[PDB]
Write a protein that binds this ligand. Structure first.
Ligand SMILES: [Cl-]
Ligand SMILES: [Cl-]
Ligand SMILES: [Cl-]
Ligand SMILES: [Cl-]
Length: 492
């Protein structure tokens, strides 16, 4: 009879560990007769296709449902009419009625009012999607989005081409939701629900009302806030009986700040711990650090559910050092290239395969070229099947400067791969056993990391032994039954 709702701002493919962790948790909860649902708050006209991909890629259980304010209010609005209203598309065809189409590309075209001698619109047509940008005095004031033959959204722009309003349309062609946007802050302001003729101060108030309409106020309903940015929305609900929990997925300390400063979103959660049933941390070390500074009495440690990869035959016998992560400063990728320099200096046969996408791509490319390591260090971009790539690595490394739990290393260890990681807050210290399943290195010590990389690369038998112990360590340490008991204890 227990229903859980796991909250994050958005769900997509090629998302990080947090979304994977929520989806894994849902699967295990559902295997234990506990409904686990996902709730998002963003607009995606193609959410159906994303959810379809997630379930077919086996990342999402078929019984895991996603609720969303746009989907929710659109389905309710669809009941209000029987026929499709074409007023919007008629208004567009009326604007371009006295205009000539000048095809600029195969996809792009421009509309020129023969009479007004003014270019009124730009159109871009792709597969299942047509965009119209509307212009007056050579200034865009509106964008119209056609998806699957119908208008799904319009955007209003000011004279600076900054978004000032958004409008959302139901499957009958009617406006059901519109919101003001702060032009320079790009923050969501006054939101208006057409059906209920209801106004909201901001997106937080609107999403809190959505949660009040979606989740019945009973004790058997549980809210688990995973997305730190979503916490205000769960806190500002009118629920009095629904159990509310917050999961800290990351080192709460301000990134690359040793002043003891804490991230704003995590600070807000921890200062409001008394207003919720409990805060869940992934490691005992993190609980200790938080309890020391915040004096929280409802802090609990439950590790992420670990999907135990099936045993396999390791055929590969190469010198490949692997790394799969989003290209973000946290992953200490500049330290990775310094390690690579020292490793290639000792063996030019060594290759560093870096999978993932992110903002640091350009910086890392420059470092690789500057260090003349283009033949050894390779940015292999985004992969769908990371497990397959890991099966072909000799070892996997982590130069990460902060971690919440450190699941990338756990995944590698389960695939019988040895691991060399920097000892960092809430990371390897729990599972990496020095000389047994890999090597825990002093943070920012490139030489010590390079030494252990070469050690493993030169001793294939050592690598295999360490790898075997890695899988065994994770199997004995992370048993899903233990974690399920801890969750059920919180729900009771
Ligand atoms: Cl009608
Ligand atoms: Cl917001
Ligand atoms: Cl911050
Ligand atoms: Cl990770």
């Amino acid at each position: 009879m227990k229903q859980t709702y796991m909250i994050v701002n958005e769900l997509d493919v090629n998302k990080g560990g947090m979304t994977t962790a929520m989806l894994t948790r849902s699967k295990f909860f559902l295997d234990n007769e506990i409904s686990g649902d996902i709730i998002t708050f963003d607009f995606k006209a193609n959410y159906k296709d994303i959810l379809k991909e997630l379930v077919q890629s086996k990342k999402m259980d078929k019984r895991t449902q996603m609720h969303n304010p746009f989907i929710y209010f659109k389905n309710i609005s669809n009941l209000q009419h029987k026929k499709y209203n074409y007023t919007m598309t008629r208004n567009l065809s009326n604007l371009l009625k006295d205009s000539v189409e000048i095809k600029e590309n195969s996809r792009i075209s421009r509309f020129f009012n023969i009479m007004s001698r003014e270019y009124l619109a730009y159109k871009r047509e792709t597969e299942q999607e047509t965009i119209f940008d509307l212009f007056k005095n050579n200034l865009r004031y509106k964008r119209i989005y056609f998806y699957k033959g119908k208008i799904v959204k319009t955007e209003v722009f000011n004279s600076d081409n900054n978004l000032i309003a958004e409008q959302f349309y139901d499957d009958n062609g009617y406006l059901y939701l519109y919101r003001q946007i702060n032009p320079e802050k790009k923050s969501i302001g006054k939101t208006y629900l057409v059906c209920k003729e209801k106004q909201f101060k901001n997106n937080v108030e609107f999403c809190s009302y959505f949660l009040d309409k979606l989740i019945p106020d009973i004790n058997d309903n549980i809210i688990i806030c995973d997305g730190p940015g979503s916490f205000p929305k769960i806190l500002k609900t009118n629920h009095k009986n629904v159990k509310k929990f917050a999961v800290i997925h990351v080192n709460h300390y301000k990134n690359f700040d040793d002043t003891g400063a804490v991230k704003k979103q995590e600070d807000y959660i921890l200062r409001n711990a008394n207003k919720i049933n409990g805060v869940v941390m992934l490691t005992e070390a993190q609980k200790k650090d938080i309890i020391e500074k915040y004096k929280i009495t409802n802090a609990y440690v439950i590790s992420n559910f670990i999907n135990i990869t099936d045993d396999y035959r390791d055929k590969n016998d190469n010198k490949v050092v692997g790394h799969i992560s989003r290209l973000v400063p946290q992953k200490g990728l500049p330290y990775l290239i310094d390690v690579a320099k020292k490793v290639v200096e000792q063996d030019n046969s060594v290759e560093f395969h870096l999978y993932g996408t992110g903002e640091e791509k350009s910086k890392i490319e420059n470092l690789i070229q500057e260090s003349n390591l283009t033949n050894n260090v390779k940015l292999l971009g985004y992969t769908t099947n990371a497990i397959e790539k890991i099966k072909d690595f000799r070892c996997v490394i982590s130069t990460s400067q902060f971690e919440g739990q450190g699941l990338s290393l756990i995944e590698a260890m389960l695939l019988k791969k040895p691991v060399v990681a920097f000892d960092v807050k809430y990371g390897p210290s729990d599972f990496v056993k020095d000389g047994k399943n890999g090597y825990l290195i002093e943070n920012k010590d490139i030489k010590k990391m390079a030494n252990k990389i070469l050690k493993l690369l030169h001793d294939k038998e050592l690598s295999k032994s360490l790898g075997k112990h890695g899988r065994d360590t994770i199997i004995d340490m992370y048993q899903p039954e233990k974690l399920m008991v801890k969750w059920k204890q919180l729900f009771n």
